[PDB]
Symmetry: C3
Subunit: 521 residues, 3 copies
């Protein structure tokens, strides 16, 4: 009763390769969950040659048929079709019952049939997420301050332990092949690959073949189901409260309420997604990634993208302020002047002379630590060629207009623009609140309540009042901006929003007051 007879289901398949038939004949008994899951995939039932017969909008392969290897064109995508691809390019290739297979199927393997998707992904911030985090000295200092501590002379935590179960679970690990292990399994002797850093399915996973990304985030193996990729649950693996509460905001939004109750009557599987005809409430994919087509006119409302950056005009994740979206996905290459001298001079006139040590310093961040007091403007990062690191105003306006075109499937244009204008005001206000907590932190360093040493960036984030400052942007300003962008309510208020942000400001002020009272006493 919903029970799948696995043997009968395998026997009814067609266009299975002789190789895959061998894998299945064994794996159906040793890993029945994998076989059942694979049986649910569109890939188990469609050959590349068949997919290429479909009209462009409906088709979900993108490597031209004549560029797909001949032995793959006329069989469904089975165990051998993925795991046996390009053995010589995979360091985790092992002999396995007469076949040369590798366990970690990578974006470069996917690209054999989905070239366009991999090309798009590889340019994205997601693909570069490990380097964006771990090869940025400032961000890595935050990683370190958050996941390491000392106990009686020794340091605990680090990349392969505390960081692997935390930051790198979402951002991605570096996978290293370190050997093999001989096991006995269901009576059979089997050699398995020994890894460091796998299992891991973070978006910027660094694979053994050097490609970047895990293509099983969003649509997990082995079902590879776009119905899952278009659900909110799948993005909720990584987009949660307190730092990146897109799932929580959406769940409380009316879009979310309606989707939970009505999605049973939506068509979640049509490759060209049709607003109205297929769904009446948007999910993450609807606004961020999906191909959207007008059900009556056939007009493309939005082209599919596997580079999510291309839809965003303003980065709501504060670093430390919200800022125009970076032009490329390699954020670790950004460099900005940290502190304008006119602002530093104004700070020093009020007794905060610490800002002086930041004049002329470059930081690997998209935006400066303070605006210029004369102009009222922040400084924006450049790339190593000296070109602007963030998108132009014209590009922001184009992206904003494309998003409004999506809303316009279900709302009038002024309605959508009104919300985007409100979002601008919240970007402005949260950025000012973040500047305020930043100045309070400079006071903490000036008065000796906290210690700082720029040659050792972990010292920016390693004490309690410094963590309060971090939360002001990383948790509260972010939540307010997210909640405004995606129609939240409590995430902009008591849970993680304005109330928390204003509380945090006062919390910092109280600590400073107690410290001064303890000194001047």
């Amino acid at each position: 009763a919903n029970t799948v007879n696995l043997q009968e289901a395998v026997a009814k398949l067609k266009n299975v390769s002789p190789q895959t038939k061998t894998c299945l004949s064994c794996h159906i008994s040793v890993t029945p969950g994998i076989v059942a899951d694979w049986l649910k995939s569109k890939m188990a039932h469609v050959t590349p040659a068949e997919a290429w017969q479909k009209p462009a909008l409906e088709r979900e392969v993108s490597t031209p048929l004549d560029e797909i290897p001949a032995n793959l064109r006329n069989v469904v995508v089975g165990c051998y079709e993925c795991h046996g691809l390009n053995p010589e390019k995979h360091p985790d290739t092992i002999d396995h019952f007469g076949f040369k297979i590798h366990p970690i199927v990578t974006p470069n393997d996917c690209a054999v049939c989905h070239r366009t998707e991999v090309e798009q992904y590889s340019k994205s911030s997601k693909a570069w997420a490990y380097y964006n985090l771990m090869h940025n000295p400032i961000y890595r200092a935050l990683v370190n301050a958050s996941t390491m501590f000392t106990c009686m002379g020794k340091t605990f935590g680090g990349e392969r332990t505390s960081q692997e179960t935390s930051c790198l679970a979402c951002h991605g690990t570096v996978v290293k092949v370190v050997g093999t292990v001989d096991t006995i399994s269901h009576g059979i002797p089997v050699t398995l690959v020994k890894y460091e850093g796998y299992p891991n399915h973070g978006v910027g996973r660094v694979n053994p073949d050097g490609s970047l990304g895990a293509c099983t985030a969003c649509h997990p193996r082995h079902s590879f189901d776009i119905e899952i990729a278009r659900s909110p649950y799948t993005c909720g693996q990584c987009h949660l409260d307190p730092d990146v509460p897109a799932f929580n905001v959406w769940k409380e939004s009316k879009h979310g309420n309606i989707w939970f109750m009505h999605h049973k009557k939506y068509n979640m599987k049509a490759p060209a997604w049709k607003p109205g005809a297929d769904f009446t409430a948007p999910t993450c994919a609807t606004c961020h990634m999906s191909l959207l087509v007008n059900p009556v006119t056939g007009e493309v409302i939005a082209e599919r993208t596997h580079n999510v950056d291309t839809r965003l005009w303003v980065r709501l994740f504060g670093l430390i302020y919200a800022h125009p979206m970076p032009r490329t996905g390699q954020h670790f290459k950004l460099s900005v002047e940290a502190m304008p001298e006119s602002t530093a001079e104004a700070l020093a006139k009020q007794g905060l002379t610490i800002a002086k040590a930041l004049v002329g310093v470059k930081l690997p961040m998209p935006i400066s630590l303070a605006p210029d007091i004369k102009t009222g403007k922040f400084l924006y990062a450049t790339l190593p060629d000296g070109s602007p690191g963030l998108i132009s105003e014209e590009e922001m306006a184009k992206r904003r207009e494309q998003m409004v075109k999506i809303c316009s499937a279900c709302h009038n244009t002024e309605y959508a623009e009104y919300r985007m204008r409100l979002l601008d005001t919240q970007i402005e206000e949260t950025n000012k609140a973040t500047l305020k907590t930043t100045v309070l932190l400079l006071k903490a360093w000036q008065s000796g309540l906290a210690h700082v040493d720029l040659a050792k960036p972990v010292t920016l984030f390693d004490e309690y009042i410094e963590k309060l400052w971090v939360e002001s942007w990383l948790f509260y300003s972010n939540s307010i901006r997210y909640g405004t962008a995606m129609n939240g309510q409590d995430w902009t208020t008591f849970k993680r929003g304005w109330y928390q942000l204003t509380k945090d400001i006062e919390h910092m002020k109280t600590l400073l007051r107690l410290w001064e009272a303890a000194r001047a006493a």
Copy 2:
């Protein structure tokens, strides 16, 4: 596959007005999501004259047929039937392809066919939610302290920005029509209304025609689906942790666990809701709003209400204590003596002389700040005519008994009463904990750790220790009472309950101790 062919669905409709046929012929291509959503509504398929043929219990119209305008009686409720209603009464009425339409359809428009529902709603605290919050000087001070701050001489945040994305998202904004904007849309020149304060769908939204409320909270447009109104998700737009965690409490409750797994076999659509026959686990609507009828006897278990106040005997939301429910929905009209003189004298004998300044002061709150030390009783608010502002004991007992009658569909009476008695003990205990944190706050003001000035109520809520006091009632006492009332577990404990409340008390005590140590040093 669940895909709706919109053109075919429109063509199969019957009793559509000539006007609406014109709207549809265009809107099917320009806003396909709205048309699909409207197609799912009961209103797209039933005329007022047809609804009036149904038996009283089954019927979901309430304005007598002969009082519904003749041109509306024999057509389904389409785009023109709502948006073209009473043009002269709506300031947002604009010419629109030959029709006089207004975008914001208001409770007064709904009342054309649903008079009883609007009459009920208009008396409720929900309808008055903007005024209850924003026109109460004390509560508005809390709004202000939570959503505004100063940075280098300037104030940031306010009604149209930080407050609009936060408090007013749930409570409601004031909608102002400020002009129009000429746009080009799908090649067509179209003039749209320019608003301040819309989009917004908070319960007390102040509409352009002066009516109060958004009738798309709970059952959103354009499906207007009671299956959504009876889901927990819809109330979860606004009833969330930390301040009003009814959704979170219910989700963890056994009622919630069972509903999540069994509701696929419930009839969520029958207008007269039948316990047992239609559902075996209650949602928010079941206990708070729904018409409930015994499936075997036909006895009405509970009459439907759109004034949720009528079912509540005790306000669990502390202001600052839990108190008997107000008699009317206009809470901003309540006035109470703040501090009994016998209590103030007792406070002053222990060195807390601040309470003296509250003797004879009236506050716009339902209950006094402290009980009378002689009698042990709180003082309750009056209304401007001097009559009691809160319901009588006899009325509380009636409401309590009506709720128990609902539980009795699925439980014995003593079982339900036992829980309501437990709730009374938690009201008593949380109120005492709130009195304790209030006295700690008086100590903070007395010792100079915090500043207060009653002529400027924002100063009640603008510092860290004051926000700790706020949380003791607004978050923790509330959560404990909610969790007890609706069968929570962790919301009464570690998440937001007893543990947090006792921690908060000690947190305040520690701050006071540190402050005194820094002084007497």
Copy 3:
């Protein structure tokens, strides 16, 4: 439309006892929800004699047929079959329309047909949960510190009030029969039992007949549905953030994401659960309790257990450190040496002389407060017979291997072992962080920032810095271990994980610094 006609459904039943027919004829009108719910149970449609005809793997009765009372063998399990069982053994037995019935049906009643399940449960930590919590003087002190306070000389909170709505809601209450109440109900005079401590359905509920447990946790009455028992929602009644966030961790895990979207195509009802054939993503029951059978080979992958302890090798809930699983469910019988003298001497050499008072002291905990500084090892508890209280290394390895066998239905063995190794590193690291906060607490007591008196254990947990210490293990270390074990992401990081733990350490250090600054001033 999903509406059940209750009268017709009752009339279609077969093998109903004459007694139950009498109960139904009345209860269908007075408690329609209970009758509808019971109608959905497998027990309403199967007799014990019929269940015994089924093959062993499929069968869900376990008391041998010839040991089930003859009058129960050939009727379905109706109202009288449960509520009329063994009247003389139940103190809440009352006369009720000619029948001798008791409202609280207990594990001993269930055992009449499900002997094996009750035998298993009765040995488990769950069955003993009230005593584990309330009869442990240290844990009871934590209960007290968290749910009681004083206001002007009087104590508020306690077992029948604050604790009943909090800790005891999950752990269980002690049910006392205290009398009866005469009510009028639907016109009928009816006497009901008056209880203290019921309603309650915590796992260790102490029933009126002296048996331990509530068999309606996990699979609630009256549907008693294993589809509910195997859902995540049901365990989420009690396994939530911040202390025991298994539900929250699972929800964010890929297992959870997939289950939410695919479970509509799973067979959630087959008594012998088949990975792959019946489901492709695991729930709580899958890994913790269920009978799992290979769909192709028929091999038992895991035997069903109602003693969840039997599957666990290491207790992730810190007391105060993570430790090997106790051998028996009676945790209140454990006793450990608290402080090794070599460690105390090392502490005293650094000025923390308080540890001296713990040398030779036994605490009712599974593990010592600090490791021995010489050996680097913790001390483990013994039982009253002096035998080891925690499982052997050999037993841990067996349990670990059994769990890996479950994962192996859907993953290779090295993949699963890799995660369990990562879990070991997190146990090690979180335990060291917990030792660090414990030493900070000893500094707080030494410096006079906090007060302690071992003769009065509530003083361990009654002040703010002490509660910060509690959270370091009870919330943060626990969440990190849970998230690692069950594939969380944000629960190991910003929500309740590494970031919070390192923040807590620094929060304690800041308080100590402020205190010292206020003294040396």
